[PDB]
Design a protein around this ligand. Structure first.
Ligand SMILES: CNc1ccc(OC(C)C)c2sc(C(=N)N)cc12
Ligand SMILES: CNc1ccc(OC(C)C)c2sc(C(=N)N)cc12
Ligand SMILES: [Cl-]
Ligand SMILES: [Cl-]
Ligand SMILES: [Mg+2]
Ligand SMILES: [Mg+2]
Ligand SMILES: [Mg+2]
Ligand SMILES: [Mg+2]
Ligand SMILES: [Mg+2]
Ligand SMILES: [Mg+2]
Lengths: 236, 12, 236, 12
């Protein structure tokens, strides 16, 4: 790999610089190189990995939705034929998105997840695995759509089971996992009632645990709780 | 279309 | 080139789609492919070319400034040594920026400018040539800095001479050229008085020609006039 | 640092 000759510490430093420069593709490449050194990632390093690829895939998802909407309009009744171009370019972006998702899943599988034994690392990586299968699910249309969906569900569910046994209900990783699994339920699995139930139960059990927290942990938890509330407000 | 809240950067 | 097998019209259509998707690197690659078909560019096509690369180089300039500021801080008295990484990564971004500038200058030289005979195309391309030498000048530090600066000045000056002879003082291309040449004077050539004089004279001679315009041309001209005013307000 | 107005997208 292109980063094989750079020190692990230098890759991490440059990932932090790229974040400051809003150079997320660079940030992602540096963190991939850091992961490929074979050592486990600290809490900070895991979050740099996640932030980098979330930003990269985020721009691709936003582009794909723009193009998918144009494509759908061009296939409506009374729409003037424009040729293969819209479909071709949507497919190009889609393929790049799928490549990024495959790259992240590849790092999780080789070998981040199998070496992660603490709840805070294992839940984090399994959440990410569910997230990147979910992004694949968003653009899936063929005969593997169901298996992609079930791969996301499976990863989320294992993370939920560990988080419920090993983490307090206000733990921000646990909270962010439940947020994302609830969105999975709502718009990927077509289970809006499960989504609403998960988000309500998650919010209420966090509320009842806030009294145990410091001022700074309180801020971290209530930030994600507000995201659960925002969704519940749209859903009910 | 309408995107619901998920964790971390809303970069999309 | 990678776009050699795609139709010119398809490249233009995909450049427009990429603009809607805010995929400016794609937009730039499509427009480079369109230019390399060897045919002259329409007014719309020239603006798609300019918008694409302006957005690409804009992100690189913004990243470079972030990193350059960090680098300068790390070289201050009392700053803790952090290693070569900041300089290395600034150099990486800088080299990518210079490559984009060289690519654009290459298209202008082979062979957009020599085939451009109308004022509106020739001024547009010569302005762009001045702009991309100016972006090179912004990161230049060695023994070619003066020649890069003079290359920008030379291109801007030829464009100004043609615009003054062939275009009305409210022409938006002429106005945008004078805006950019004034910024060149102020911060590249270290001639703030020339910058202020050019911006004032340009604004006043446009003001006196607005009465000749339609409502829509009026809007186009006064938009760029406000940019001249914004700069004059900062400069005086 | 402080960037002055130039033509077209202020993409930087
Ligand atoms: C959930 N977000 C984060 C949690 C913990 C983090 O590290 C602590 C351990 C010092 C970091 S660091 C970072 C970034 N965007 N550079 C983001 C996070
Ligand atoms: C200065 N800006 C533009 C002027 C003229 C243009 O085309 C007319 C001729 C139809 C276009 S088209 C476009 C874009 N961003 N796609 C930008 C401009
Ligand atoms: Cl394509
Ligand atoms: Cl580097
Ligand atoms: Mg080493
Ligand atoms: Mg496909
Ligand atoms: Mg119900
Ligand atoms: Mg042809
Ligand atoms: Mg250099
Ligand atoms: Mg004076």
């Amino acid at each position: 790999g292109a980063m094989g000759s750079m020190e692990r510490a230098s890759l991490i430093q440059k990932a932090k610089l790229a974040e400051q420069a809003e150079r997320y593709e660079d940030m992602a490449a540096f963190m991939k190189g850091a992961v490929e050194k074979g050592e486990e990632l600290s809490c900070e390093e895991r979050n740099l990995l996640s932030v980098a690829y979330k930003n990269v895939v985020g721009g691709q998802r936003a582009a794909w939705r723009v193009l998918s909407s144009i494509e759908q309009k061009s296939n409506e009744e009374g729409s003037e034929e424009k040729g293969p171009e819209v479909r071709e370019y949507r497919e190009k972006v889609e393929t790049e998105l799928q490549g990024v998702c495959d790259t992240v899943l590849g790092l999780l599988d080789s070998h981040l997840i199998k070496e992660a034994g603490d709840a805070e690392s294992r839940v984090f990586y399994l959440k990410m695995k569910g997230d990147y299968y979910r992004y694949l699910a968003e653009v899936a249309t063929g005969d593997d759509k169901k298996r992609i969906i079930d791969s996301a569900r499976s990863a989320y569910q294992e993370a939920m089971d560990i988080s419920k046994k090993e983490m307090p209900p206000t733990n921000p990783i646990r909270l962010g996992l439940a947020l994302n699994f609830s969105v999975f339920h709502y718009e990927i699995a077509n289970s809006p009632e499960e989504a609403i139930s998960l988000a309500k139960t998650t919010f209420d059990e966090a509320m009842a645990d806030l009294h145990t927290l410091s001022e700074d942990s309180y801020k971290d938890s209530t930030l994600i709780m507000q995201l659960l509330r925002d969704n519940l407000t749209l859903w009910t | 279309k309408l995107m619901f809240k998920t964790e971390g950067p809303d970069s999309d």
